[PDB]
Amino acid sequence: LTQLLKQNQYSPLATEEQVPLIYAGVNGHLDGIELSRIGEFESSFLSYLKSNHNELLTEIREKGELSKELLASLKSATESFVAT
Amino acid sequence: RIDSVSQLQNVAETTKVLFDVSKETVELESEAFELKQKVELAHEAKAVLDSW
Amino acid sequence: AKSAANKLDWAKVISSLRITGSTATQLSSFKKRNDEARRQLLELQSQPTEVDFSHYRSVLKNTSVIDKIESYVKQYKPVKIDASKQLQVIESFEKHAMTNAKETESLVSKELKDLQSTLDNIQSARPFDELTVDDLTKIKPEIDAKVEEMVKKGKWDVPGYKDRFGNLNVM
Numbered sequence: 001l002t003q004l005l006k007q008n009q010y011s012p013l014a015t016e017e018q019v020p021l022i023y024a025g026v027n028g029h030l031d032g033i034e035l036s037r038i039g040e041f042e043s044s045f046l047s048y049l050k051s052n053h054n055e056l057l058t059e060i061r062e063k064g065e066l067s068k069e070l071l072a073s074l075k076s077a078t079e080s081f082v083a084t
Numbered sequence: 085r086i087d088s089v090s091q092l093q094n095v096a097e098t099t100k101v102l103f104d105v106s107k108e109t110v111e112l113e114s115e116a117f118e119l120k121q122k123v124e125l126a127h128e129a130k131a132v133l134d135s136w
Numbered sequence: 137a138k139s140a141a142n143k144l145d146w147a148k149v150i151s152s153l154r155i156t157g158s159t160a161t162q163l164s165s166f167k168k169r170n171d172e173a174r175r176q177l178l179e180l181q182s183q184p185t186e187v188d189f190s191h192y193r194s195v196l197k198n199t200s201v202i203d204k205i206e207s208y209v210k211q212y213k214p215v216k217i218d219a220s221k222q223l224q225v226i227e228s229f230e231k232h233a234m235t236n237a238k239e240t241e242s243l244v245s246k247e248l249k250d251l252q253s254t255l256d257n258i259q260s261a262r263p264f265d266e267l268t269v270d271d272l273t274k275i276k277p278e279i280d281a282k283v284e285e286m287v288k289k290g291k292w293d294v295p296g297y298k299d300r301f302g303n304l305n306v307m
Contacts, residue, residue: 047169047173048169050173050176051138051142051169051172051173051176052138052139052142053139054139055139080142080146083146083149083150084149085251086248086251086252086255089244089247089248089251090244090248091154092154092240092244093244093248095151095237095240095241096237096238096240096241097241098144098147098148098151099148099233099237100230100233100234100237101144102144102145102148103229103230103233104230104233105141105144106141106145106164106165106168107164107226107229107230109138109141109168109172110164110167110168110171111222111226113171113172113174113175114218114219114220115218116171116174116175116178116179117218118215118216118217118218119178119179119182120178121215121216122185122212122215123178123181123182123183123185125185125209125212125215126183126185126186126187126209129187129205129208129209130183130187132201132205133187133192133193133196133201133202133205136196136198136201136202
C-alpha cells in the first residue's frame with residue numbers, strides 16, 4: 001500500500017479509477033505481486049478495466065456508491081487480473 | 085489418470101473459440117492504425133496553426 | 137462486446153493452469169491487450185480531426201495558409217484503406233486449430249468412458265485370493281517368456297522381489 005500510493009506529477013486519477021486500486025489493496029491481492037511490480041500493475045489493471053470492465057467504471061461514475069452486486073462484480077473483475 | 089484426462093473435457097470446444105476470437109482481437113485494429121495516421125496529421129495541422 | 141472475449145480469456149487462463157509454460161499464447165493475450173489499450177487511448181485521444189474553419193481559422197486574421205492546409209487535409213481525407221488482407225493463411229491457422237482440437241476432443245471423449253469402463257472392470261473382477269498363475273500366463277505370455285529366458289540364461293536370482301516379497305527362509 002505504501003508503494004501503491006505513489007503518483008507522478010500531472011497524473012490525477014478519477015474516482016472511478018481510484019476505487020479498484022483501493023479494493024485490490026484492502027483484499028490482500030497485492031501481497032503475491034512483487035513490491036516493484038506494483039507500479040506497472042496499477043496502469044496494467046487500469047487499462048485492463050478500461051478495456052473490459054468499462055461498464056463498472058461508468059457505474060462508479062454515475063453512482064459514486066458500490067452496491068453488493070457492484071461489489072461482487074468488482075471482486076470478479078479484480079481477481080481475474082489478479083490471476084496475473 | 086481419469087481425473088487428469090477429465091480436466092481436458094471441454095477444452096477443444098472452447099479453445100476453437102479462444103483461437104479465433106483472440107486472433108481477431110489482435111488483428112482487427114489496422115483501422116485504428118490508419119486512424120492514427122489521420123490523428124497525427126490533424127495533430128501537426130493544429131500545431132502549425134498554433135504557430136501561425 | 138470485448139468483455140465476453142476477455143471473460144473467455146480468463147476462463148482460458150484458469151484452464152491454462154493445466155498447461156504451465158505457454159510460450160506465446162499468453163503473449164498473444166499480451167499483444168491483444170497491448171494494442172487494444174493503444175487503440176482505445178488513440179480513439180479517446182482523437183479530436184474531430186480537423187481545423188475549425190469557423191473559430192480557429194478566424195482566430196488567425198492573417199490567414200494565408202489555413203485554406204491551404206485545410207484543403208490539404210480534405211485532400212488527404214481519403215487517408216488510406218485498412219488491411220483485411222488475411223483470409224487465406226489465417227484460415228489455415230484455424231484449420232490446424234480445428235484439426236488438432238477435434239483430434240484431442242475425440243480422443244478424450246473416447247478415453248473418458250474407456251477408463252470409466254476400466255474402473256468398473258477393476259470394481260467387480262478382482263480375484264485377489266483365487267487367481268491362477270496359468271491365467272497370468274494366459275493374460276500375459278510375457279510371463280512365460282521371462283520365466284523361460286530366466287531359466288535358460290541362468291539368472292536364477294529374482295531381482296526386485298525380496299524387497300516387498302520377503303524370502304521367508306531359514307537363513
